């Protein structure tokens, strides 16, 4: 009951919202049968990678996740292309969000996003779902206070070298501990307000600079405590890397004293919303950690 099979005649693509390595995302409308309302949805049309039944079996898995920081597949249509339906998130992905708010994001937001991403990843680890492509472009913003991971398993069932653990580059090994590497790069993206990692360095060179011990640089706003977390995510020995549940704890601890761990100009005037604005955001958009 968690996956709705849609017929092509009950939804329509309206405008393209983006494209990626795996398909095209549309703003769409769902038109309930026998009703006169048009409900906005998001539609992902995949590129060609599988029998329809095997695709449906993978879809039931994507539809069965249940965690506030992980997107769930809601509906699917397999008549022509593979078309995936989920709730429309008007804020888009977190990478675009942080670039758009470049030096106007407080430390409380940044650290809470790190907590939320670690929580969704930890849940995927519990379900034995390896993401393979965690990055700020695959974290969706439901509200600025609530982010959600999408597209786990998409990489497998269908190449982000600059987000991949060394063992994934050299040997195509993909585990939860290689997702931890990508988590560290995702944290780096957030802390640099969406900088491109290893900008200007060709992808084919990343393996060699990693083996020489070079890593992404310390973001200007990060205290060493935050930067050490990222460095630990990029250890060559995958079993030396942090676990997602250890990352939740560490980033949650930091979120309780955020201005001690990130150094942001004007941070004092960039706190989380008052209870009034939070209640308003939740009532309108989100009916489903603070300083001490
Ligand atoms: C990266 S860009 C991007 N994508 C999307 C998008 C749109 C619709 C659906 C999805 N994803 C899933 O349904 C899904 C998921 F929920 C969890 C895991 C997962 O693996 C998948 C994918 N997946 C597969 O690989 C796959 C293979 C075989 C069978 C079945 C499946 C299968 O379902 C994503 C957006 C987006 C979404 C909502 N609002 C906006 N708003 C603005 C302003 O942009 C953007 N942005």
From Swiss-Prot:
This chain's source organism reads: Homo sapiens
Report the function annotation for this chain. Receptor tyrosine kinase binding ligands of the EGF family and activating several signaling cascades to convert extracellular cues into appropriate cellular responses. Known ligands include EGF, TGFA/TGF-alpha, AREG, epigen/EPGN, BTC/betacellulin, epiregulin/EREG and HBEGF/heparin-binding EGF. Ligand binding triggers receptor homo- and/or heterodimerization and autophosphorylation on key cytoplasmic residues. The phosphorylated receptor recruits adapter proteins like GRB2 which in turn activates complex downstream signaling cascades. Isoform 2 may act as an antagonist of EGF action.
What is the protein name stated in its UniProt record? Epidermal growth factor receptor
Q: Which GO terms describe its cellular component?
A: basal plasma membrane; basolateral plasma membrane; cell junction; cell surface; ciliary basal body; cilium; clathrin-coated endocytic vesicle membrane; cytoplasm
Q: Which residues form the active site?
A: 133 (proton acceptor)
Binding residue positions for ATP: 17-25, 44, 86-87, 151
Q: How is it modified after translation?
A: Phosphorylated on Tyr residues in response to EGF. Dephosphorylation by PTPRJ prevents endocytosis and stabilizes the receptor at the plasma membrane. Dephosphorylated by PTPN1 and PTPN2. Monoubiquitinated and polyubiquitinated upon EGF stimulation; which does not affect tyrosine kinase activity or signaling capacity but may play a role in lysosomal targeting. Polyubiquitin linkage is mainly through 'Lys-63', but linkage through 'Lys-48', 'Lys-11' and 'Lys-29' also occurs. Deubiquitination by OTUD7B prevents degradation. Ubiquitinated by RNF115 and RNF126. Ubiquitinated by ZNRF1 or CBL at different lysines in response to EGF stimulation; leading to recruitment of the ESCRT machinery and subsequent degradation in the lysosomes.
| Shown segment, full-protein numbering | 702 to 1014 of 1210
Query: Per the database record, which ranges form the Protein kinase domain?
Result: 11-262
**What is the associated disease?**
Lung cancer: A common malignancy affecting tissues of the lung. The most common form of lung cancer is non-small cell lung cancer (NSCLC) that can be divided into 3 major histologic subtypes: squamous cell carcinoma, adenocarcinoma, and large cell lung cancer. NSCLC is often diagnosed at an advanced stage and has a poor prognosis. Neonatal nephrocutaneous inflammatory syndrome: An autosomal recessive disorder characterized by intrauterine growth retardation, premature birth, fragile skin, recurrent skin infections and sepsis, failure to thrive, nephrocalcinosis, and nephromegaly with tubular dysfunction. Some patients have chronic diarrhea, and necrotizing enterocolitis.
- Protein's GO biological process: cell morphogenesis; cell surface receptor signaling pathway; cell-cell adhesion; cellular response to amino acid stimulus; cellular response to epidermal growth factor stimulus; cellular response to estradiol stimulus; cerebral cortex cell migration; digestive tract morphogenesis
- Which consequence is recorded for altering residue 8 to A? Found in a lung cancer sample; more sensitive to gefitinib than wild-type
